[PDB]
Design a protein around this ligand. Sequence first.
Ligand SMILES: [Mg+2]
Length: 66
Amino acid sequence: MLEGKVKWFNSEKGFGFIEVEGQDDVFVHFSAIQGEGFKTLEEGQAVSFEIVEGNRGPQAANVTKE
Ligand SMILES: [Mg+2]
C-alpha cells in the first residue's frame, strides 16, 4: 500500500487527486474510498491506497483515510 495525501477533491462529483512525493498524482474516485458513511475526501487528508490500472489508465483503489 502506497501513501500520499489528497491534493484536492471535488466532494460534489466525488473525484480528485492524491499527490505522492516524487511521483505522478493519482486520480481518485469516490468509489475507491473505504470505510463507512458518505464517501468523500478533504484536501490534505493522508491516505493509504493502491493504484489499479486497466484500459482507462491508473487510478486509486482501496483508499483509506490515515
Ligand atoms: Mg506535486
